[PDB]
Amino acid sequence: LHHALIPHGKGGRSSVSGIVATVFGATGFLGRYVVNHLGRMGSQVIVPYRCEPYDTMHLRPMGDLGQIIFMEWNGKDKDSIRKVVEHSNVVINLVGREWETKNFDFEDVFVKIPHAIAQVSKEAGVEKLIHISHLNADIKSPSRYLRSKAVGEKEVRAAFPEATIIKPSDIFGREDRFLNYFASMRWFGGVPLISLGKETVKQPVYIVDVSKGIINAIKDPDAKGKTFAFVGPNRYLLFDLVQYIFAVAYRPFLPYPLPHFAYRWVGRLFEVSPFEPWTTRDKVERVHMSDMTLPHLPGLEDLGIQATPLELKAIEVLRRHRTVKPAKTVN
Amino acid sequence: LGLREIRIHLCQRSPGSQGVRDFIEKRYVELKKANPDLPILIRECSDVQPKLWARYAFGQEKNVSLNNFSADQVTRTLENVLSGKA
Amino acid sequence: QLIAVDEKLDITTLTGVPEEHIKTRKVRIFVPARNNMQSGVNNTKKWKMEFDTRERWENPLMGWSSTADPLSNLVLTFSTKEDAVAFAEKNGWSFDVEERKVPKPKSKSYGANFSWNKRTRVSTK
Amino acid sequence: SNIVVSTRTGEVMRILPRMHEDINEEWISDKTRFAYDGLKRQRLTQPMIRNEKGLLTYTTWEDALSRVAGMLQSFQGNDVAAIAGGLVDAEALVALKDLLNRVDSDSLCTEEVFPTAGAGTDLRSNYLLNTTIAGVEEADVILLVGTNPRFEAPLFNARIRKSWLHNDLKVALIGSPVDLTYRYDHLGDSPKILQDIASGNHPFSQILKEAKKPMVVLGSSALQRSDGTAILAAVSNIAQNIRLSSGVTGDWKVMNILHRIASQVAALDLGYKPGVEAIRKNPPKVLFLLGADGGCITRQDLPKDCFIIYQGHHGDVGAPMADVILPGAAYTEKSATYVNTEGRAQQTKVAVTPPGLAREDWKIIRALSEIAGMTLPYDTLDQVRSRLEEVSPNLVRYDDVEGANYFQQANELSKLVNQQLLADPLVPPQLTIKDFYMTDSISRASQTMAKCVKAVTEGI
Amino acid sequence: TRPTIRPRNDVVHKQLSAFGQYVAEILPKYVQQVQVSCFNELEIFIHPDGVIPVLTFLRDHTNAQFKSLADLTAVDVPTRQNRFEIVYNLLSLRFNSRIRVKTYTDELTPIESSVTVYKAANWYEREIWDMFGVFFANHPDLRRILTDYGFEGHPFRKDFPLSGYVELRYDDEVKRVVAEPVELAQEFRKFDLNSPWEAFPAYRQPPE
Amino acid sequence: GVRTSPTGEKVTHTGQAYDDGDYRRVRFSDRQKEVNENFAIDLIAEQPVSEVGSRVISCDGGGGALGHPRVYINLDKETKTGTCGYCGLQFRQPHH
Amino acid sequence: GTSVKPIFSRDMNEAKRRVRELYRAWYREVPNTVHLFQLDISVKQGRDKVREMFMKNAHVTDPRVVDLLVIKGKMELEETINVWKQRTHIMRFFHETEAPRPTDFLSKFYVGHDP
Numbered sequence A: 001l002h003h004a005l006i007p008h009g010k011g012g013r014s015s016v017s018g019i020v021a022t023v024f025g026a027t028g029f030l031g032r033y034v035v036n037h038l039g040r041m042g043s044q045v046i047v048p049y050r051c052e053p054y055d056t057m058h059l060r061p062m063g064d065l066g067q068i069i070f071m072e073w074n075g076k077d078k079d080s081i082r083k084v085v086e087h088s089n090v091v092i093n094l095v096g097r098e099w100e101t102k103n104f105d106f107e108d109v110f111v112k113i114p115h116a117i118a119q120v121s122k123e124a125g126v127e128k129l130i131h132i133s134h135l136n137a138d139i140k141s142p143s144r145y146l147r148s149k150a151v152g153e154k155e156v157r158a159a160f161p162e163a164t165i166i167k168p169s170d171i172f173g174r175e176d177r178f179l180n181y182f183a184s185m186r187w188f189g190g191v192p193l194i195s196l197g198k199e200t201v202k203q204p205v206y207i208v209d210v211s212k213g214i215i216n217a218i219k220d221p222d223a224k225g226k227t228f229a230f231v232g233p234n235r236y237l238l239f240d241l242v243q244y245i246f247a248v249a250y251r252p253f254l255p256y257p258l259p260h261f262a263y264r265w266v267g268r269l270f271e272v273s274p275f276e277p278w279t280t281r282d283k284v285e286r287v288h289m290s291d292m293t294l295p296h297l298p299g300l301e302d303l304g305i306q307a308t309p310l311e312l313k314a315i316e317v318l319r320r321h322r323t324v325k326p327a328k329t330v331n
Numbered sequence B: 001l002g003l004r005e006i007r008i009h010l011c012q013r014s015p016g017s018q019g020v021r022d023f024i025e026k027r028y029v030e031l032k033k034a035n036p037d038l039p040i041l042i043r044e045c046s047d048v049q050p051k052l053w054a055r056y057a058f059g060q061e062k063n064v065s066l067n068n069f070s071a072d073q074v075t076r077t078l079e080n081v082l083s084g085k086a
Numbered sequence C: 001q002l003i004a005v006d007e008k009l010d011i012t013t014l015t016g017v018p019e020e021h022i023k024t025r026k027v028r029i030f031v032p033a034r035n036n037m038q039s040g041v042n043n044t045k046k047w048k049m050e051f052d053t054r055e056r057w058e059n060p061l062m063g064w065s066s067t068a069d070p071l072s073n074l075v076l077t078f079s080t081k082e083d084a085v086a087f088a089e090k091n092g093w094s095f096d097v098e099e100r101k102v103p104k105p106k107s108k109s110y111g112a113n114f115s116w117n118k119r120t121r122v123s124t125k
Numbered sequence D: 001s002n003i004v005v006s007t008r009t010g011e012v013m014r015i016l017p018r019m020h021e022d023i024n025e026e027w028i029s030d031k032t033r034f035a036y037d038g039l040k041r042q043r044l045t046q047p048m049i050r051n052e053k054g055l056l057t058y059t060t061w062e063d064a065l066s067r068v069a070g071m072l073q074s075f076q077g078n079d080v081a082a083i084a085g086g087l088v089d090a091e092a093l094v095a096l097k098d099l100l101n102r103v104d105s106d107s108l109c110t111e112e113v114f115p116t117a118g119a120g121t122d123l124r125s126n127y128l129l130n131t132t133i134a135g136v137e138e139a140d141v142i143l144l145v146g147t148n149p150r151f152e153a154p155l156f157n158a159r160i161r162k163s164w165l166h167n168d169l170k171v172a173l174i175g176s177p178v179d180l181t182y183r184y185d186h187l188g189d190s191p192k193i194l195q196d197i198a199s200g201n202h203p204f205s206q207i208l209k210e211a212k213k214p215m216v217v218l219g220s221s222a223l224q225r226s227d228g229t230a231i232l233a234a235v236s237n238i239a240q241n242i243r244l245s246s247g248v249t250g251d252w253k254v255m256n257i258l259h260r261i262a263s264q265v266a267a268l269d270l271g272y273k274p275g276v277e278a279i280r281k282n283p284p285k286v287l288f289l290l291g292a293d294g295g296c297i298t299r300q301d302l303p304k305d306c307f308i309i310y311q312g313h314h315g316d317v318g319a320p321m322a323d324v325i326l327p328g329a330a331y332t333e334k335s336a337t338y339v340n341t342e343g344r345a346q347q348t349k350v351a352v353t354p355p356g357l358a359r360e361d362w363k364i365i366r367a368l369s370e371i372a373g374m375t376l377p378y379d380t381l382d383q384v385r386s387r388l389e390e391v392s393p394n395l396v397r398y399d400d401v402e403g404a405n406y407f408q409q410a411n412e413l414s415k416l417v418n419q420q421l422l423a424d425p426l427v428p429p430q431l432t433i434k435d436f437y438m439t440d441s442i443s444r445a446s447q448t449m450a451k452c453v454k455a456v457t458e459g460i
Numbered sequence E: 001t002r003p004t005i006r007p008r009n010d011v012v013h014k015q016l017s018a019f020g021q022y023v024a025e026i027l028p029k030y031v032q033q034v035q036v037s038c039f040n041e042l043e044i045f046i047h048p049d050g051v052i053p054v055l056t057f058l059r060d061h062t063n064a065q066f067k068s069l070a071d072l073t074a075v076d077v078p079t080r081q082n083r084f085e086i087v088y089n090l091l092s093l094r095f096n097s098r099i100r101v102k103t104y105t106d107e108l109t110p111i112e113s114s115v116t117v118y119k120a121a122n123w124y125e126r127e128i129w130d131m132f133g134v135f136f137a138n139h140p141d142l143r144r145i146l147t148d149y150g151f152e153g154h155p156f157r158k159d160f161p162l163s164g165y166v167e168l169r170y171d172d173e174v175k176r177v178v179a180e181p182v183e184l185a186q187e188f189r190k191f192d193l194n195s196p197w198e199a200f201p202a203y204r205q206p207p208e
Numbered sequence F: 001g002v003r004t005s006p007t008g009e010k011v012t013h014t015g016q017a018y019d020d021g022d023y024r025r026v027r028f029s030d031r032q033k034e035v036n037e038n039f040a041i042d043l044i045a046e047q048p049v050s051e052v053g054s055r056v057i058s059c060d061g062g063g064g065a066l067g068h069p070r071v072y073i074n075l076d077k078e079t080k081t082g083t084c085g086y087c088g089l090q091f092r093q094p095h096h
Numbered sequence G: 001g002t003s004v005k006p007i008f009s010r011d012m013n014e015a016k017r018r019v020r021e022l023y024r025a026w027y028r029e030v031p032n033t034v035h036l037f038q039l040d041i042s043v044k045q046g047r048d049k050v051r052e053m054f055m056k057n058a059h060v061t062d063p064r065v066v067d068l069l070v071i072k073g074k075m076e077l078e079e080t081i082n083v084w085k086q087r088t089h090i091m092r093f094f095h096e097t098e099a100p101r102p103t104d105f106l107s108k109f110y111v112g113h114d115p
């Protein structure tokens, strides 16, 4: 087990956990939680970044002295991937984008980059690879996002046959794009939902649950070639979910049914802007689409985690959106 | 049901072990002549009541106090343990 | 003006020590042995209480020696064995007491070096 | 011998002597002082198993322990056996004994041979140095039989030399005329001389008769030969003649046995079978090697596909022949109980923790018992020492050397068998200094001892 | 004595001895011992019951009038049955003199607060309570003054570890400062400096 | 006297170099490894042995009080040369 | 004999009366503390934490130790009510960032040498 990678200490900041993890996409929303959980137990984290060092500054205090190493990379180059994963025994893939840029479409982000990462990691001798896809990923999905994810799973499995695939369902949290997107609709007055938000059912999952699940999948010896589905405890109709979100935020709720075609047109207008879009054609289709049910897939409970309901963390997420009657669930 | 070993813990100078001591000095040898393959481990307590441990198959152990017993009493206890009757 | 309550002293709930550093620790009460490199005996006068050794590992950066137990450097000094025992019992620490070792007095005789018939006669000096 | 381990930043730096008047006074042997170099070499740091190619490969604790537990559940009784090495503490010995007893296995053996006839290990005084190390200063005649005290017990030899120098102690030896750093009387090499002393024709019988505090010391190395029972019987006859003629001066305890390995007395106290003849008579199918590095039992003496477990701290003659390797702790890395040749129980302290994934030995055995479903009652070191008190209560008295003498019963029980002596001269394993440096697995892994061996064999 | 040796002052020594005998004579109910050091410092060892009287006397007597409280602190000596010794340093401007008053207590026995005698004591006793855990009865408001809020233990006790039991960091998951058990990247190096071959024969203890 | 490890790293004067499987090498990527190029053992091995016609010689390292403590070196052994324990300079008597 | 000077209470009954008074004060204060510090815990689990902290010291049979603990608890309540504590100080009672330590023998044997 390479003596330098033998765990030591009491699992704290200056302990040694025996884990050398390269975390692609660590500067995002789930990346900060994954890096924090890795660093608080004494692992060494290699953080490949393509942005400005200033935007990665917040990850520095997450580890002891020398336990977090920042490295430049870009997804179009295999040599940067190679130099970033040479010495790791764990590779975690978190690269994703909810919109298409002029330089990267869904094909580059969810297919080509994951395939390159998996191939380079397999050539480099990395023991464990953990790839993130979507719960609703399938090759026949209406949205290109999900279709790309399905393709990505196929290529990651082909390049790294022992990779662990994790399929979360609409992660919610303090820096999420779920609760904040639904609560950011106050500016536009009445909320617009296709068919009044009464036809789609969501199963959101807490961010800390997903991060701890990734950590425990690293720890678990037999979770090599398995595929997990990380879902929350409760399923909600979208209408009552948004009603609960607005009630927690103390904001007035005025939901009006909107035509699907009309909604798509609205989404398209947002996309043209250079800056990140509040909504996109793919986004409105993704939030209108119902969450899949995969009972045969091992879940978060199979990793020794009890999923935390949205009712406990909704206040934490939505308190900043201000200036009791939890929603009804369907199971 | 098969006896595996016997242990006799007696104290060197205590009055309560005196009879037990006499037992050895008189007849331990004779017992060993009758049970040449049975281990009877004689060990020393201190500030503690004398004891007799018997170990049976699969690690089962029973202990009986020998405090203030005479030589005949410990002889009877050992015969009862050895013959298997309670 | 006096309660006259009968119970052994116990201050564990007041010292602020975490639970796993009371019941899991094993203190040793002893007179330290003389360093054999020197003949001075001034370091063997008092009683010492010290804690059990815990894990020490290597810092991945700089290779320094890292520890996780807060009592690794704690040593207390006592005048007698009884004082140290009382301190340990009132602090709720399980202890092992080692009796003091005193070098027994010896019979020295310079003239024995030049013995007429005994083997104590030396061949060189 | 009491010692001080000097460490720094989690590393053993040196060994110094610790003063104890009764045992080692102020000195330690060269091996004791300089063999700690081997603690940093050839160490066992991870659990190991056999792969499909038959080679040893690293694995987790769960994998190796489950693999051992499966075979432990598959077989039972006579098919399970264990061997203890020379550096095993009492806690691990009692844990292994309990674990094998829960399988209904009584074949728990030591590599060192002690004769089991008559009393055997039944009476403690039958296998102890009853006079004690300090008692050598009260003796006036000492007879050494088939031993080299200079290399087997250097501090005991130093005590003999001190008594010889200051009390005009008379020393006689039966065996090869080794250099003992003092002059002595060489009675001869043939073991038959013992009988000639017991009969009374040898004038040394008269010399022993006139003595007020006579001493007879028989080494265990002489017991390692096939005549161990007969040699012990002859020495017992000599001591019995001394007591019957010279009378009972009091509590002098003439008979003595000098041991060479640290774990032997504790194992005999716990009821282990001395020697490995039980394994040879009934070969097992699963064999536990608790630090057994003497090479007494190999795969040739075992059935095909015998499952061998080695638990220890050093990679030596016992590890490469094993199917599962469990990394244990050395004596500097645990708080453990050892009983010396006097019968005195003493305890070490943790100086550094075991390296890598190595663990405390009794903890390994307790975890294995839990995985196999035969969980042992004790969970902490205090509970294991309570178990030791239950099995042998003298193992928790940490400086006591006094005990009861049962020489008379053992003497009459030694007159049952009548094994004959061979015409083989008593030759100790350590003939010269070069044989003293390398004896155990720690010393064999030391470069300091290798340099010492090179220096003595050829000198510049 | 040559230039490297501190000069002695017998006049101040005699004066301090005489005043110590005077104080002991006036209050035999509480004064257990009186000492003068070789560098002319006077200490009076008293029973804990006499903290308020003796101090009051030393503050208000025409011949003493020690009107200033320079310092009040505690010393932890674990080998003693009464663990803590309480030390008052008083200054008299009228007679240009200093005095020290010593008493003792254990973990559970309270000591009378002396804020009624000296206002300056108010914070000092608080600090003692923070650092040694000695309770002062009838203190106007006794609470921690130096340690962090919610701090457990009393750091100046001898058995308290140097680095403590908990350390602080910032956690991003909970977005706040958290406290966790201490873990040092480099352990503090304990040095054994005391030599054998005693230094001062005049302080040698009987071998018992 | 800097050498090169088979992996490619410079071996320091203390002889340290991460082995091939060592993850800690990742700390040197996109950066450099600090190695001192002046090896003291080689540099002191280059100093010539001083020839002195005295049985005992004193060495202070040169510079007076700016050197090391003054020590005295015996030169009776002809097989070897006297070496300063502080500075490493070598001294020898004129044999033949 | 064994006569000692009191602190506040002469026997255990007065000590338990003081303990009950402090417990009432903490129980009353919990909801206001939850609202003022904008805690994400519930009032129920805050009162459970108060109960657990009180039960941690349930084995004390010495009245002096009891009312010293009462004094310390009153100091803690004083710190909480006057908002001298911050949110981090209040949340330190819950140990939310510490990974749980298993208690069984096998897990401790696996993680390391620490009992």
Ligand SMILES: NC(=O)C1=CN([C@@H]2O[C@H](COP(=O)(O)OP(=O)(O)OC[C@H]3O[C@@H](n4cnc5c(N)ncnc54)[C@H](OP(=O)(O)O)[C@@H]3O)[C@@H](O)[C@H]2O)C=CC1
Pocket (backbone or CB within 6 Å): A024, A025, A026, A027, A028, A029, A030, A031, A049, A050, A051, A074, A075, A093, A094, A095, A096, A097, A098, A104, A109, A132, A133, A134, A135, A167, A168, A169, A170, A171, A172, A177, A178
């Ligand atoms: N609701 C959710 O959040 C869900 C997320 N997932 C999946 O989990 C993963 C993490 O999600 P989340 O943290 O929200 O993602 P974010 O959008 O928060 O961050 C993704 C990370 O990938 C990096 N990245 C994006 N595009 C590129 C590119 N072209 N080249 C290099 N790096 C790039 C970003 O770096 P930079 O900041 O420099 O652009 C960023 O750090 C995603 O892959 C997503 O598909 C799955 C289900 C639900």
Ligand SMILES: [Zn+2]
Pocket (backbone or CB within 6 Å): F059, F060, F061, F068, F084, F085, F086, F087, F088, F089
């Ligand atoms: Zn020099």
